[PDB]
């Protein structure tokens, strides 16, 4: 386990073999479990030397060792990754992508993956040096199944990083270019490949509806829905995210999610033991109850209202906050008949109980839901009857105490309610 001092002696001898051996030492050092001396290595000025070895097509072993060493540096902090980039590593790794040694090609893949993932600027800079053709070319085989697992998984993870990040989103033409390959990966039988594809798809659908559209046009929604009900949390998690993003777009885009069978997975998603799954499932549901009355009706037909009632009753508070949002949206666009169904399913009690939440937003949201339900009651004349349920379920006091509340919108609507409906 060489000292940094020795590695530098090795690397600075102009002896190819001493160089090779010193680099290998460096690589083992940087692979150390506890606190590998990345900064030390960086400060010794070794990076340019390493980047230079990447070009020695003759000693492929020093190409490999220096790739690996570089990879372990770039896999660290954003400043560490910057040092690898400043060293000139990007074009050098892109050339390596074409190495006849899979183990070397693979290193280059891994390196570009870590550089692209630092953020959007490095992502784009890597795209500019033309990484995409050589990357995609590594996957230009009729059946992905003939590729080695580790290899495929690295390719998938790297491509995922090139899809990652906002401000800005990746170049559109880059996203067009990558999609068809990313869609093949999304249909692959390997759990890790699947998870990282979904992550990629979820990155790409986080944005303007135009972005959502290019993804949905590829026909991935049915595959997403399938992965939505997988047994592996690492797959479900990103799949739910991609689904959730898509239903933030147009109603027609949301309809494709409904059409693919997505809603049938929500009984279990909305009761999922993992809190974030539940949270995001309720979030997703809120952007579905924000849609058309026919889409709300499908939420109804799938038996999901009793599940929303459930989540509103007992769940992590954040989840409850999403549930309140889903009910307000439901009461907004819903028909009177649908709103009536919501009450019969037991929405009032758990609604009133959350008016005790010391969270200004959820209060504003709930009171909004209460108006919408009252206005439905008005069209039936049944405004009084409702007024009673809310007193019987303990709400009247809370809507009252909320007159005095610090926020304006809160005490405004708190008062509005009492006058129209409670006097």
């Amino acid at each position: 386990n060489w000292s940094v001092e020795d590695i530098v002696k090795g690397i600075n001898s102009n002896n190819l073999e001493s160089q090779l051996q010193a680099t290998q030492a460096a690589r083992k050092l940087l692979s150390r479990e506890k606190q590998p001396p990345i900064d030390n290595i960086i400060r010794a000025g070794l990076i340019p030397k390493f980047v230079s070895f990447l070009g020695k097509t003759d000693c492929s072993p020093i190409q490999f060792e220096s790739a690996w060493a570089l990879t372990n540096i770039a896999s660290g902090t954003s400043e560490q990754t910057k040092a690898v980039v400043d060293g000139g590593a990007i074009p050098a790794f892109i050339s390596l992508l074409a190495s006849p040694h899979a183990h070397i090609s693979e290193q280059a893949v891994w390196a570009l993956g870590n550089i692209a993932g630092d953020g959007s600027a490095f992502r784009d800079l890597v795209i500019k040096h033309g990484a995409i053709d050589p990357l995609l070319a590594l996957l230009a085989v009729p059946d992905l199944s003939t590729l080695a697992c580790g290899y495929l998984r690295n390719l998938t993870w790297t491509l995922s990083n090139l899809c990652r990040n906002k401000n800005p989103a990746p170049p559109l033409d880059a996203v067009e270019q990558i999609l068809p390959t990313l869609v093949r990966l999304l249909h692959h039988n390997d759990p890790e490949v699947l998870a990282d594809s979904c992550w990629a798809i979820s990155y790409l659908t986080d944005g303007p509806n135009e972005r959502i559209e290019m993804v949905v046009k590829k026909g991935v929604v049915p595959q997403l829905v399938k992965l939505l009900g997988a047994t592996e949390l690492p797959i479900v998690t990103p799949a739910l995210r991609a689904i959730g993003n898509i239903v933030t777009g147009t109603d027609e885009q949301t309809q494709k999610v409904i059409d693919a069978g997505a809603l049938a997975v929500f009984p279990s998603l909305l009761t999922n033991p993992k809190t974030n799954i539940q949270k995001e499932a309720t979030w997703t549901m809120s952007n579905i109850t924000a849609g058309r009355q026919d889409q709300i009706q499908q939420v109804v037909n799938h038996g999901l209202v009793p599940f929303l009632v459930g989540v509103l009753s007992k769940a992590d508070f954040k989840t409850q906050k999403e549930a309140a949002w889903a009910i307000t949206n439901y009461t907004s666009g819903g028909t009177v008949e649908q709103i009536v169904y919501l009450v019969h399913c037991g929405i009032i009690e758990p609604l009133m109980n959350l008016l005790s939440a010391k969270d200004t937003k959820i209060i504003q949201v709930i009171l909004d839901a209460i108006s919408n339900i009252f206005q439905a009651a008005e069209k039936l004349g049944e405004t009084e009857k409702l007024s009673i349920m809310i007193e019987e379920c303990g709400g009247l006091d809370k809507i009252e105490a909320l007159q005095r509340h610090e926020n304006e919108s809160v005490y405004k609507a708190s008062l509005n309610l009492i006058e129209k409906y409670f006097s």
Partner: peptide
């Protein structure tokens, strides 16, 4: 309402 919320 009806309000779309992204992000995540």
């Amino acid at each position: 309402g009806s309000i779309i919320r992204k992000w995540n």
